Nucleic acid binder design. Sequence first.
RNA 1: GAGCUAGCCCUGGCCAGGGUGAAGCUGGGGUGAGACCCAGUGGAGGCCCGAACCGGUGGGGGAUGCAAACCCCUCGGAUGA
RNA 2: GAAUGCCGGCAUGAGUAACGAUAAAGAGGGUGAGAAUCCCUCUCGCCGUAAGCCCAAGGGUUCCUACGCAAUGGUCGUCAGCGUAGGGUUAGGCGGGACCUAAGGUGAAGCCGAAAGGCGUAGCCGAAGGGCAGCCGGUUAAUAUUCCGGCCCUUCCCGCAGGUGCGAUGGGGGGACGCUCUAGGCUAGGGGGACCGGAGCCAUGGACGAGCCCGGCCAGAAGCGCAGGGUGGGAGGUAGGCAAAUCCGCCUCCCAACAAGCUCUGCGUGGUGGGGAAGCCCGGGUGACAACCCCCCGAAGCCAGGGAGCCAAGAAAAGCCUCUAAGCACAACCUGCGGGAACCCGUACCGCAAACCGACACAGGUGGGCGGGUGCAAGAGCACUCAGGCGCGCGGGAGAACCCUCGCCAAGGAACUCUGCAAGUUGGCCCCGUAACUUCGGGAGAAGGGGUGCUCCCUGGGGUGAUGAGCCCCGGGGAGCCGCAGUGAACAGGCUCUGGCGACUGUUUACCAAAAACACAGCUCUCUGCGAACUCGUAAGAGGAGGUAUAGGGAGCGACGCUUGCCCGGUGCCGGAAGGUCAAGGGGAGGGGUGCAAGCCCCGAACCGAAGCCCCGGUGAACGGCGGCCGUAACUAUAACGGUCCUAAGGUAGCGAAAUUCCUUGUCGGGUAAGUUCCGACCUGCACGAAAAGCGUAACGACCGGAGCGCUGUCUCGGCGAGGGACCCGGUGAAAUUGAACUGGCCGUGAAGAUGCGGCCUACCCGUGGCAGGACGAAAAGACCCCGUGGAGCUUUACUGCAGCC
RNA 3: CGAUGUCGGCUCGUCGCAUCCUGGGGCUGAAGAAGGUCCCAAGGGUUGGGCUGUUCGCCCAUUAAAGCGGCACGCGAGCUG
RNA 4: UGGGAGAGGGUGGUGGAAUUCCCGGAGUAGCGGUGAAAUGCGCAGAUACCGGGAGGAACGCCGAUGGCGAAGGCAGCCACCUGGUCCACCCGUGACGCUGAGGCGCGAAAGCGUGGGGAGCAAACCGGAUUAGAUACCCGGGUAGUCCACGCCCUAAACG
RNA 5: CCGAGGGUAGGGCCCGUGACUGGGGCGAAGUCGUAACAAGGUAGCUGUACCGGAAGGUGCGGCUGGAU
Lengths: 275, 48
Amino acid sequence: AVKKFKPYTPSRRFMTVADFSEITKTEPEKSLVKPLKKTGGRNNQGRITVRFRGGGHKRLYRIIDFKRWDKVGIPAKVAAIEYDPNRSARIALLHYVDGEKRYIIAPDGLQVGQQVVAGPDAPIQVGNALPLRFIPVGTVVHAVELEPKKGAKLARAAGTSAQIQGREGDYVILRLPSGELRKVHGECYATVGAVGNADHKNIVLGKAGRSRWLGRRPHVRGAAMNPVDHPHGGGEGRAPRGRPPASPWGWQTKGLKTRKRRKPSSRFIIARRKK
Amino acid sequence: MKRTWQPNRRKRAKTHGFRARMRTPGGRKVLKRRRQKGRWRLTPAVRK
RNA sequence: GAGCUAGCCCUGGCCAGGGUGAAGCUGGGGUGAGACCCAGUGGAGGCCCGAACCGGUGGGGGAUGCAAACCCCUCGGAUGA
RNA sequence: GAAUGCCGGCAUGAGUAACGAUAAAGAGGGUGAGAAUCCCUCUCGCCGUAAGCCCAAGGGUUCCUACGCAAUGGUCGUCAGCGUAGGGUUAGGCGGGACCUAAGGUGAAGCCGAAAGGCGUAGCCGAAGGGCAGCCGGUUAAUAUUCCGGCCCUUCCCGCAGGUGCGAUGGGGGGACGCUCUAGGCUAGGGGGACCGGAGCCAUGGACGAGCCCGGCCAGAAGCGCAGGGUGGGAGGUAGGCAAAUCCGCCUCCCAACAAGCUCUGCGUGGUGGGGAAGCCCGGGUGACAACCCCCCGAAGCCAGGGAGCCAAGAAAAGCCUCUAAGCACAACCUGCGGGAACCCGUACCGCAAACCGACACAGGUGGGCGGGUGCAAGAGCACUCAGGCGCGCGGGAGAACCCUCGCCAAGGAACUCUGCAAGUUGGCCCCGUAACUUCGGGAGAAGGGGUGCUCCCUGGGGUGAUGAGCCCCGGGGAGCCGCAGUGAACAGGCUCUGGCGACUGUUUACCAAAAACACAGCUCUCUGCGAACUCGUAAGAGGAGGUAUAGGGAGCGACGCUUGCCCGGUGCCGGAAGGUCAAGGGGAGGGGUGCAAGCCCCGAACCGAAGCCCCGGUGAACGGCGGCCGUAACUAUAACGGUCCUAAGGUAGCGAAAUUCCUUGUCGGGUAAGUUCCGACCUGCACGAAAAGCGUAACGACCGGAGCGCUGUCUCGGCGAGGGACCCGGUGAAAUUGAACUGGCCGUGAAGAUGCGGCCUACCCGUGGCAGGACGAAAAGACCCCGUGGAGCUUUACUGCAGCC
RNA sequence: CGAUGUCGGCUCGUCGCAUCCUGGGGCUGAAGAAGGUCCCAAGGGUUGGGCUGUUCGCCCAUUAAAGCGGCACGCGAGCUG
RNA sequence: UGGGAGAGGGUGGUGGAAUUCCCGGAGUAGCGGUGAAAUGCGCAGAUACCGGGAGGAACGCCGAUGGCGAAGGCAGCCACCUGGUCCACCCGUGACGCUGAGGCGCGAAAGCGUGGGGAGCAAACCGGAUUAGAUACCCGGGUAGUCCACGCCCUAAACG
RNA sequence: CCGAGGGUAGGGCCCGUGACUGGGGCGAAGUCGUAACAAGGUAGCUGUACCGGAAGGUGCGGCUGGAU
Ligand SMILES: [Mg+2]
Ligand SMILES: [Mg+2]
Ligand SMILES: [Mg+2]
Ligand SMILES: [Mg+2]
Ligand SMILES: [Mg+2]
Ligand SMILES: [Mg+2]
Ligand SMILES: [Mg+2]
Ligand SMILES: [Mg+2]
Ligand SMILES: [Mg+2]
Ligand SMILES: [Mg+2]
Ligand SMILES: [Mg+2]
Ligand SMILES: [Mg+2]
Ligand SMILES: [Mg+2]
Ligand SMILES: [Mg+2]
Ligand SMILES: [Mg+2]
Ligand SMILES: [Mg+2]
Ligand SMILES: [Mg+2]
Ligand SMILES: [Mg+2]
Ligand SMILES: [Mg+2]
Ligand SMILES: [Mg+2]
Ligand SMILES: [Mg+2]
Ligand SMILES: [Mg+2]
Ligand SMILES: [Mg+2]
Ligand SMILES: [Mg+2]
Ligand SMILES: [Mg+2]
Ligand SMILES: [Mg+2]
Ligand SMILES: [Mg+2]
Ligand SMILES: [Mg+2]
Ligand SMILES: [Mg+2]
Ligand SMILES: [Mg+2]
Ligand SMILES: [Mg+2]
Ligand SMILES: [Mg+2]
Ligand SMILES: [Mg+2]
Ligand SMILES: [Mg+2]
Ligand SMILES: [Mg+2]
Ligand SMILES: [Mg+2]
Ligand SMILES: [Mg+2]
Ligand SMILES: [Mg+2]
Ligand SMILES: [Mg+2]
Ligand SMILES: [Mg+2]
Ligand SMILES: [Mg+2]
Ligand SMILES: [Mg+2]
Ligand SMILES: [Mg+2]
Ligand SMILES: [Mg+2]
Ligand SMILES: [Mg+2]
Ligand SMILES: [Mg+2]
Ligand SMILES: [Mg+2]
Ligand SMILES: [Mg+2]
Ligand SMILES: [Mg+2]
Ligand SMILES: [Mg+2]
Ligand SMILES: [Mg+2]
Ligand SMILES: [Mg+2]
Ligand SMILES: [Mg+2]
Ligand SMILES: [Mg+2]
Ligand SMILES: [Mg+2]
Ligand SMILES: [Mg+2]
Ligand SMILES: [Mg+2]
Ligand SMILES: [Mg+2]
Ligand SMILES: [Mg+2]
Ligand SMILES: [Mg+2]
Ligand SMILES: [Mg+2]
Ligand SMILES: [Mg+2]
Ligand SMILES: [Mg+2]
Ligand SMILES: [Mg+2]
Ligand SMILES: [Mg+2]
Ligand SMILES: [Mg+2]
Ligand SMILES: [Mg+2]
Ligand SMILES: [Mg+2]
Ligand SMILES: [Mg+2]
Ligand SMILES: [Mg+2]
Ligand SMILES: [Mg+2]
Ligand SMILES: [Mg+2]
Ligand SMILES: [Mg+2]
Ligand SMILES: [Mg+2]
Ligand SMILES: [Mg+2]
Ligand SMILES: [Mg+2]
Ligand SMILES: [Mg+2]
Ligand SMILES: [Mg+2]
Ligand SMILES: [Mg+2]
Ligand SMILES: [Mg+2]
Ligand SMILES: [Mg+2]
Ligand SMILES: [Mg+2]
Ligand SMILES: [Mg+2]
Ligand SMILES: [Mg+2]
Ligand SMILES: [Mg+2]
Ligand SMILES: [Mg+2]
Ligand SMILES: [Mg+2]
Ligand SMILES: [Mg+2]
Ligand SMILES: [Mg+2]
Ligand SMILES: [Mg+2]
Ligand SMILES: [Mg+2]
Ligand SMILES: [Mg+2]
Ligand SMILES: [Mg+2]
Ligand SMILES: [Mg+2]
Ligand SMILES: [Mg+2]
Ligand SMILES: [Mg+2]
Ligand SMILES: [Mg+2]
Ligand SMILES: [Mg+2]
Ligand SMILES: [Mg+2]
Ligand SMILES: [Mg+2]
Ligand SMILES: [Mg+2]
Ligand SMILES: [Mg+2]
Ligand SMILES: [Mg+2]
Ligand SMILES: [Mg+2]
Ligand SMILES: [Mg+2]
Ligand SMILES: [Mg+2]
Ligand SMILES: [Mg+2]
Ligand SMILES: [Mg+2]
Ligand SMILES: [Mg+2]
Ligand SMILES: [Mg+2]
Ligand SMILES: [Mg+2]
Ligand SMILES: [Mg+2]
Ligand SMILES: [Mg+2]
Ligand SMILES: [Mg+2]
Ligand SMILES: [Mg+2]
Ligand SMILES: [Mg+2]
Ligand SMILES: [Mg+2]
Ligand SMILES: [Mg+2]
Ligand SMILES: [Mg+2]
Ligand SMILES: [Mg+2]
Ligand SMILES: [Mg+2]
Ligand SMILES: [Mg+2]
Ligand SMILES: [Mg+2]
Ligand SMILES: [Mg+2]
Ligand SMILES: [Mg+2]
Ligand SMILES: [Mg+2]
Ligand SMILES: [Mg+2]
Ligand SMILES: [Mg+2]
Ligand SMILES: [Mg+2]
Ligand SMILES: [Mg+2]
Ligand SMILES: [Mg+2]
Ligand SMILES: [Mg+2]
Ligand SMILES: [Mg+2]
Ligand SMILES: [Mg+2]
Ligand SMILES: [Mg+2]
Ligand SMILES: [Mg+2]
Ligand SMILES: [Mg+2]
Ligand SMILES: [Mg+2]
Ligand SMILES: [Mg+2]
Ligand SMILES: [Mg+2]
Ligand SMILES: [Mg+2]
Ligand SMILES: [Mg+2]
Ligand SMILES: [Mg+2]
Ligand SMILES: [Mg+2]
Ligand SMILES: [Mg+2]
Ligand SMILES: [Mg+2]
Ligand SMILES: [Mg+2]
Ligand SMILES: [Mg+2]
Ligand SMILES: [Mg+2]
Ligand SMILES: [Mg+2]
Ligand SMILES: [Mg+2]
Ligand SMILES: [Mg+2]
Ligand SMILES: [Mg+2]
Ligand SMILES: [Mg+2]
Ligand SMILES: [Mg+2]
Ligand SMILES: [Mg+2]
Ligand SMILES: [Mg+2]
Ligand SMILES: [Mg+2]
Ligand SMILES: [Mg+2]
Ligand SMILES: [Mg+2]
Ligand SMILES: [Mg+2]
Ligand SMILES: [Mg+2]
Ligand SMILES: [Mg+2]
Ligand SMILES: [Mg+2]
Ligand SMILES: [Mg+2]
Ligand SMILES: [Mg+2]
Ligand SMILES: [Mg+2]
Ligand SMILES: [Mg+2]
Ligand SMILES: [Mg+2]
Ligand SMILES: [Mg+2]
Ligand SMILES: [Mg+2]
Ligand SMILES: [Mg+2]
Ligand SMILES: [Mg+2]
Ligand SMILES: [Mg+2]
Ligand SMILES: [Mg+2]
Ligand SMILES: [Mg+2]
Ligand SMILES: [Mg+2]
Ligand SMILES: [Mg+2]
Ligand SMILES: [Mg+2]
Ligand SMILES: [Mg+2]
Ligand SMILES: [Mg+2]
Ligand SMILES: [Mg+2]
Ligand SMILES: [Mg+2]
Ligand SMILES: [Mg+2]
Ligand SMILES: [Mg+2]
Ligand SMILES: [Mg+2]
Ligand SMILES: [Mg+2]
Ligand SMILES: [Mg+2]
Ligand SMILES: [Mg+2]
Ligand SMILES: [Mg+2]
Ligand SMILES: [Mg+2]
Ligand SMILES: [Mg+2]
Ligand SMILES: [Mg+2]
Ligand SMILES: [Mg+2]
Ligand SMILES: [Mg+2]
Ligand SMILES: [Mg+2]
Ligand SMILES: [Mg+2]
Ligand SMILES: [Mg+2]
Ligand SMILES: [Mg+2]
Ligand SMILES: [Mg+2]
Ligand SMILES: [Mg+2]
Ligand SMILES: [Mg+2]
Ligand SMILES: [Mg+2]
Ligand SMILES: [Mg+2]
Ligand SMILES: [Mg+2]
Ligand SMILES: [Mg+2]
Ligand SMILES: [Mg+2]
Ligand SMILES: [Mg+2]
Ligand SMILES: [Mg+2]
Ligand SMILES: [Mg+2]
Ligand SMILES: [Mg+2]
Ligand SMILES: [Mg+2]
Ligand SMILES: [Mg+2]
Ligand SMILES: [Mg+2]
Ligand SMILES: [Mg+2]
Ligand SMILES: [Mg+2]
Ligand SMILES: [Mg+2]
Ligand SMILES: [Mg+2]
Ligand SMILES: [Mg+2]
Ligand SMILES: [Mg+2]
Ligand SMILES: [Mg+2]
Ligand SMILES: [Mg+2]
Ligand SMILES: [Mg+2]
Ligand SMILES: [Mg+2]
Ligand SMILES: [Mg+2]
Ligand SMILES: [Mg+2]
Ligand SMILES: [Mg+2]
Ligand SMILES: [Mg+2]
Ligand SMILES: [Mg+2]
Ligand SMILES: [Mg+2]
Ligand SMILES: [Mg+2]
Ligand SMILES: [Mg+2]
Ligand SMILES: [Mg+2]
Ligand SMILES: [Mg+2]
Ligand SMILES: [Mg+2]
Ligand SMILES: [Mg+2]
Ligand SMILES: [Mg+2]
Ligand SMILES: [Mg+2]
Ligand SMILES: [Mg+2]
Ligand SMILES: [Mg+2]
Ligand SMILES: [Mg+2]
Ligand SMILES: [Mg+2]
Ligand SMILES: [Mg+2]
Ligand SMILES: [Mg+2]
Ligand SMILES: [Mg+2]
Ligand SMILES: [Mg+2]
Ligand SMILES: [Mg+2]
Ligand SMILES: [Mg+2]
Ligand SMILES: [Mg+2]
Ligand SMILES: [Mg+2]
Ligand SMILES: [Mg+2]
Ligand SMILES: [Mg+2]
Ligand SMILES: [Mg+2]
Ligand SMILES: [Mg+2]
Ligand SMILES: [Mg+2]
Ligand SMILES: [Mg+2]
Ligand SMILES: [Mg+2]
Ligand SMILES: [Mg+2]
Ligand SMILES: [Mg+2]
Ligand SMILES: [Mg+2]
Ligand SMILES: [Mg+2]
Ligand SMILES: [Mg+2]
Ligand SMILES: [Mg+2]
Ligand SMILES: [Mg+2]
Ligand SMILES: [Mg+2]
């Protein structure tokens, strides 16, 4: 569920917040957080290269285990579910009978004090990680690597998931969160289940101030600018676009496809995104 | 009202000082020119 | 040249007093169970009044100025973008 | 002799403006050649969340003393932040370094770039963050946590004794963290005392008194006491913490568990060392063997790494602890004790300002801490006042106009004006009470009204004590008293009705615009499968993101409610293995130059040969577009209806003389005595219309219209009064401007608006206070306008390039 | 064009007369009273409101009357904006 | 107490046919549609046929004039959870009953909100026809919706 | 002290009236088309939704009060 407020300010009328119900630990494991070097959208030349960034709440980066084939065979107990400010999904503290402690991203249904394991031999149960070639056809799955041993890269945000669709030799056919149908190497690891915190999308920021807490500086329309700034600049009074709608740098921004048509991965993408 | 000159010794030495000029090709040319003109002060004197 | 100014980054600091009284909690009523209702507790909020502090609304003064943007009266924000 | 020339000198305006906050002065005494201005005393006024004290920047001797007054000081000067000379700044513990890391910077390895240079994990540098051992008093003309005194403490070295597997840049723990609210107990600070100490005082009608006035503490090791912080103990197994490990992490059993225990801090006490008022004696002396005690209030500070709740989820590294590795175990470390040793730099002074930033001793600007008392409900607000500091470096008169800032006003009450601009009114707190509409929060301090001082009597609970008195806090109910008036002074909303625009708090043209503009949650389209798209860079490399489609980029729209129609012919975008056009290149029919030759060289047809365009289709919250004519109904009028030309298709719902309406003050209705504005309608909409969104909408607004009530010098219509100026005398003394001037009116003339020409009229010479009609008055080589084959910003289906992309 | 500030208002006036009123007249289709129309006459007078920036105009309530023009569409080194 | 019949209801799982789309093959001049046609689709390789795949909705035969439910309404199969109802024994209770203004709950379809999902169908719409005209009936397209979750809506020829 | 009432302020109910506007009833001698009663020439009716000059149409589900 999502927490509404009585309208005792103009902004509380619409503000909604997560209920944080799955959370069992309000402090992060000390040996798994490191400082997160806030950038403000500036790069090593100090120049803004991503606009309208900066000024949000201080964060510590929680080290997430995006490999898990790291420790095949070693079971682990789900000791906690925690709040990570660096991602939409929730994180789960794992206590490996090994003694080691790691964070995975918390799947839907993951239970405090359940056991999970990685490997070709793991059961097909929520929180376990296997190479794709051993997960059966049809199961939904998250934390998916794109290439073997390079780390989980697909289906990582709250609520998302991918579904196995069948085997074609060394490769499995996935349906990504976007609807794209892609081949992925069978030795790529994934984790059975979908990502948790699926109510994430239903959250209503409510006020400009909420966006600022998130480090989102206000976005300003090109139509509000001058010709030295933006193709949509100028005009006396309000002005329609008077040209195909365009970015601050001139390229067209309604429909113009932008993936490179010679990119070598094209040989592995079966069907483009649908919606 | 708040004027333009707000003295600050660390800023002065760190921006115009001798070790800042010697860093860059531009800064050395500054020193070369001011030595060629016979300037008594190569660089702003800041108390330290 | 960013010791003015604009943004961001790191690290510190500041915000008298008063008012309103959200959720939750407890008690009671209610019901098959509930919803919900009433009182108490409670202390939320780009919440209210108002100094510091940040502003610069209207008028008046000033106009070889006290001042190359100031002064008086008034007025905006003041836990938050 | 002119260039609004250049440099310099000196004029004119002129004894003119001004002499920099309207907090304020008066007298006596002294010094001196000279005194409103220096020193001293008395009186007066002003700041007191400062206009007082301390600190950090910045300044760099401005500090202290002696001598001095040319210049500096807006006057004066005997004085001074000025001239000269001499003196003055003392640290193991305060601050920085011989410690740590932050962003950032630099940068072994490594990567990139014509060069110069650009990056770059580790490392290093980098603080006002972490860390680390001194408190009180005394002393100097001037330094003091630095010197001295009293009492404490830190590290390094060496030695002794006891103890221990010692040992690290390696492993681990810890350091280590947000916001808001908050408990307990303390301390800083404060108030009272009929109690303790104290020089005195009795006035002018009364008082020799529970009289007045003054003061009644500070630091302190170990112990102890009080309050708090932190921390489970034992054994076994152990595959993880890039070696090892007894440490830590993980599993299991036992015991203890809101306890105590061990530990740490705070406060109190504490051997001891200090301090010590008024008053009157010439900073010092006495007071004084000063006393140094009780009660209340009480922090935002302390215990502290406390507690709760919340979402936006809140640095690092070292010091420290623990673990082991080599090694070494005659060492080494731990603990106690003892002697020795303990470096470099800062320290004066100003510091909300006459010493800093503003050219000035400039009404401006400048970060942190302390900031007393009484009353007003509270408070850092307001009034007065303590401590401390000042009266703002020109004065003395006068009592015009006029200006400024201020007070009041008969009768009227917005009649003022573009506008109630401005100024009145209202104004705190307590009680009563309170409408449309509403998103059920509000609107709301709605509106409106009553209370408010003091005295006596009775009385209810709380805090501290003890349960009581005392103090202190929140009350209640009667009875009276006085004045024009009881938040008696100061600080402190005028209100209502109704349209427009923007949902809202926010942001903006530093220095003419604060808005209806920007932003904003939210909505939609669209791009992006991760070495993402996109952005910066030649590149390396970065951001994006240590993120992964519930994500990131781009665009429009802009809470919310109800909605968002038709047109894909043109442009854009997207899809389309056909076809057409298509460059290099391929291919070489055929043709040429030359050579005696083999040969060399050159041209060149069909055919093959990409993207792009052309072609087919899709696509509107993509660019954009959304008609005209004729005729027809029992009376006129009009046209549901029929016809026809055109188009890609002819504007749907809603709204409409509107932030849009030309005609226009449309017409009708409302309000008014009267209404080019306002509201409500109508619809021939010059020229609304659905995300450059359409129509509404509670709440909000220093936004812009219209009206009413309250109240007013806004006005009829002005009068008086106050202070700072203006005026006069003494001191000091500018400015732009200036062809030269011995510079009147009229009517004419004149390059067409004459002091300067003609005629006539008028007029003795020279100033002071005033007013602004002229000198086409001053200022600025007109911003409008044109001209120049002048410039620059911006646009695009102008031309031609380039990056980028294919 | 090395600048001649530009509408309206407010303030202060001053002038012309082709006269709105008051005074003097002739003609009348002047009975009276009231008008019409021309002549002489510039001495004085020529109101307060609603609307709009407005000039002008219209309207309200009055009036003897509510005149029309010039003075750089009089007057910004006088004000307003 | 002991038995029975049933599309009664809720949650989850799950099986086959068909429709559409995408891919591979093979193949060629039409297909589709109607009362007759045209729009449409198709030499850029359709229709018809074979292989593979994805996805949604509905449940052929059984199926009947049948069964169940208070009504609305309920249909592949499996399990769990749960309601009502009939029978036989005549064992227990001892009039504990009938109705029911108010209240509360349920309430087909369409419609609304938030989010999913979207094959087939199909308001609005666009185009072809038909026709005197044809904003319709017929044809080719086509968006909501139809489906899932949760929250509203509370209507009916909600009828026997 | 209470007190007729008067005064200020803010509320509730009722009535009359209003530029303009919504449909209703009646009028009948008009214009348009022909929705329903026959299978009424697309069986009708229906709740609802969307749309159309008008009657009405269409979708989804329901009824028979439907001819053959
Ligand atoms: Mg809410
Ligand atoms: Mg709430
Ligand atoms: Mg709630
Ligand atoms: Mg709101
Ligand atoms: Mg509100
Ligand atoms: Mg919550
Ligand atoms: Mg959660
Ligand atoms: Mg935390
Ligand atoms: Mg760490
Ligand atoms: Mg990181
Ligand atoms: Mg980062
Ligand atoms: Mg860097
Ligand atoms: Mg930048
Ligand atoms: Mg960007
Ligand atoms: Mg940015
Ligand atoms: Mg942030
Ligand atoms: Mg999270
Ligand atoms: Mg392979
Ligand atoms: Mg959850
Ligand atoms: Mg969430
Ligand atoms: Mg969001
Ligand atoms: Mg955004
Ligand atoms: Mg924007
Ligand atoms: Mg602009
Ligand atoms: Mg620029
Ligand atoms: Mg450009
Ligand atoms: Mg441009
Ligand atoms: Mg434009
Ligand atoms: Mg334009
Ligand atoms: Mg514009
Ligand atoms: Mg425009
Ligand atoms: Mg604009
Ligand atoms: Mg614009
Ligand atoms: Mg705009
Ligand atoms: Mg607009
Ligand atoms: Mg335009
Ligand atoms: Mg546009
Ligand atoms: Mg255009
Ligand atoms: Mg790949
Ligand atoms: Mg500064
Ligand atoms: Mg400095
Ligand atoms: Mg510094
Ligand atoms: Mg600096
Ligand atoms: Mg330097
Ligand atoms: Mg020099
Ligand atoms: Mg020299
Ligand atoms: Mg230099
Ligand atoms: Mg700066
Ligand atoms: Mg910080
Ligand atoms: Mg504050
Ligand atoms: Mg309360
Ligand atoms: Mg609670
Ligand atoms: Mg507020
Ligand atoms: Mg607030
Ligand atoms: Mg300011
Ligand atoms: Mg102002
Ligand atoms: Mg004012
Ligand atoms: Mg004034
Ligand atoms: Mg002025
Ligand atoms: Mg000026
Ligand atoms: Mg001021
Ligand atoms: Mg002021
Ligand atoms: Mg104020
Ligand atoms: Mg306020
Ligand atoms: Mg406040
Ligand atoms: Mg607050
Ligand atoms: Mg705020
Ligand atoms: Mg903040
Ligand atoms: Mg000459
Ligand atoms: Mg000159
Ligand atoms: Mg000159
Ligand atoms: Mg000159
Ligand atoms: Mg010169
Ligand atoms: Mg003069
Ligand atoms: Mg001056
Ligand atoms: Mg002055
Ligand atoms: Mg004053
Ligand atoms: Mg003197
Ligand atoms: Mg003298
Ligand atoms: Mg003196
Ligand atoms: Mg005080
Ligand atoms: Mg200086
Ligand atoms: Mg000196
Ligand atoms: Mg000194
Ligand atoms: Mg002198
Ligand atoms: Mg002198
Ligand atoms: Mg002298
Ligand atoms: Mg001088
Ligand atoms: Mg001076
Ligand atoms: Mg002397
Ligand atoms: Mg001086
Ligand atoms: Mg000396
Ligand atoms: Mg010492
Ligand atoms: Mg050393
Ligand atoms: Mg370091
Ligand atoms: Mg350092
Ligand atoms: Mg430091
Ligand atoms: Mg220190
Ligand atoms: Mg001490
Ligand atoms: Mg000294
Ligand atoms: Mg941390
Ligand atoms: Mg800290
Ligand atoms: Mg905060
Ligand atoms: Mg006190
Ligand atoms: Mg005290
Ligand atoms: Mg007493
Ligand atoms: Mg205690
Ligand atoms: Mg081990
Ligand atoms: Mg003494
Ligand atoms: Mg003595
Ligand atoms: Mg004694
Ligand atoms: Mg506080
Ligand atoms: Mg805590
Ligand atoms: Mg959150
Ligand atoms: Mg670090
Ligand atoms: Mg030991
Ligand atoms: Mg040394
Ligand atoms: Mg030194
Ligand atoms: Mg010192
Ligand atoms: Mg100040
Ligand atoms: Mg200060
Ligand atoms: Mg001074
Ligand atoms: Mg100075
Ligand atoms: Mg001065
Ligand atoms: Mg000053
Ligand atoms: Mg004090
Ligand atoms: Mg008060
Ligand atoms: Mg008060
Ligand atoms: Mg105040
Ligand atoms: Mg006092
Ligand atoms: Mg004075
Ligand atoms: Mg005088
Ligand atoms: Mg009066
Ligand atoms: Mg009035
Ligand atoms: Mg009145
Ligand atoms: Mg007005
Ligand atoms: Mg007041
Ligand atoms: Mg009302
Ligand atoms: Mg309400
Ligand atoms: Mg009131
Ligand atoms: Mg009294
Ligand atoms: Mg106490
Ligand atoms: Mg009084
Ligand atoms: Mg005052
Ligand atoms: Mg107020
Ligand atoms: Mg007012
Ligand atoms: Mg109102
Ligand atoms: Mg609006
Ligand atoms: Mg606004
Ligand atoms: Mg705005
Ligand atoms: Mg908005
Ligand atoms: Mg806003
Ligand atoms: Mg605010
Ligand atoms: Mg401005
Ligand atoms: Mg400006
Ligand atoms: Mg400017
Ligand atoms: Mg400027
Ligand atoms: Mg201004
Ligand atoms: Mg502005
Ligand atoms: Mg504003
Ligand atoms: Mg703006
Ligand atoms: Mg905006
Ligand atoms: Mg929206
Ligand atoms: Mg670039
Ligand atoms: Mg890189
Ligand atoms: Mg990164
Ligand atoms: Mg991302
Ligand atoms: Mg905007
Ligand atoms: Mg909006
Ligand atoms: Mg509504
Ligand atoms: Mg088109
Ligand atoms: Mg097109
Ligand atoms: Mg075009
Ligand atoms: Mg040949
Ligand atoms: Mg659309
Ligand atoms: Mg067009
Ligand atoms: Mg458009
Ligand atoms: Mg139109
Ligand atoms: Mg249409
Ligand atoms: Mg109209
Ligand atoms: Mg009108
Ligand atoms: Mg309108
Ligand atoms: Mg228009
Ligand atoms: Mg026009
Ligand atoms: Mg008009
Ligand atoms: Mg007009
Ligand atoms: Mg009119
Ligand atoms: Mg008219
Ligand atoms: Mg108006
Ligand atoms: Mg107007
Ligand atoms: Mg009309
Ligand atoms: Mg636009
Ligand atoms: Mg506003
Ligand atoms: Mg405003
Ligand atoms: Mg006056
Ligand atoms: Mg007076
Ligand atoms: Mg006076
Ligand atoms: Mg005065
Ligand atoms: Mg006076
Ligand atoms: Mg005289
Ligand atoms: Mg002469
Ligand atoms: Mg003349
Ligand atoms: Mg003359
Ligand atoms: Mg002459
Ligand atoms: Mg002459
Ligand atoms: Mg002559
Ligand atoms: Mg002459
Ligand atoms: Mg004359
Ligand atoms: Mg003059
Ligand atoms: Mg004058
Ligand atoms: Mg002249
Ligand atoms: Mg002139
Ligand atoms: Mg010029
Ligand atoms: Mg020039
Ligand atoms: Mg010129
Ligand atoms: Mg010019
Ligand atoms: Mg011209
Ligand atoms: Mg030319
Ligand atoms: Mg030419
Ligand atoms: Mg150019
Ligand atoms: Mg240029
Ligand atoms: Mg591109
Ligand atoms: Mg000119
Ligand atoms: Mg000139
Ligand atoms: Mg000029
Ligand atoms: Mg006359
Ligand atoms: Mg007669
Ligand atoms: Mg005559
Ligand atoms: Mg006259
Ligand atoms: Mg005259
Ligand atoms: Mg007018
Ligand atoms: Mg005019
Ligand atoms: Mg007019
Ligand atoms: Mg009359
Ligand atoms: Mg008359
Ligand atoms: Mg005139
Ligand atoms: Mg004219
Ligand atoms: Mg003219
Ligand atoms: Mg004029
Ligand atoms: Mg002017
Ligand atoms: Mg004017
Ligand atoms: Mg004028
Ligand atoms: Mg002038
Ligand atoms: Mg003048
Ligand atoms: Mg003049
Ligand atoms: Mg203006
Ligand atoms: Mg072919
Ligand atoms: Mg059947
Ligand atoms: Mg009932
Ligand atoms: Mg229903
Ligand atoms: Mg629906
Ligand atoms: Mg579909
Ligand atoms: Mg037709
Ligand atoms: Mg629809
Ligand atoms: Mg919809
Ligand atoms: Mg039936
Ligand atoms: Mg009465
Ligand atoms: Mg009476
Ligand atoms: Mg029909
Ligand atoms: Mg019919
Ligand atoms: Mg029919
Ligand atoms: Mg219609
Ligand atoms: Mg029609
Ligand atoms: Mg239809
Ligand atoms: Mg039925």
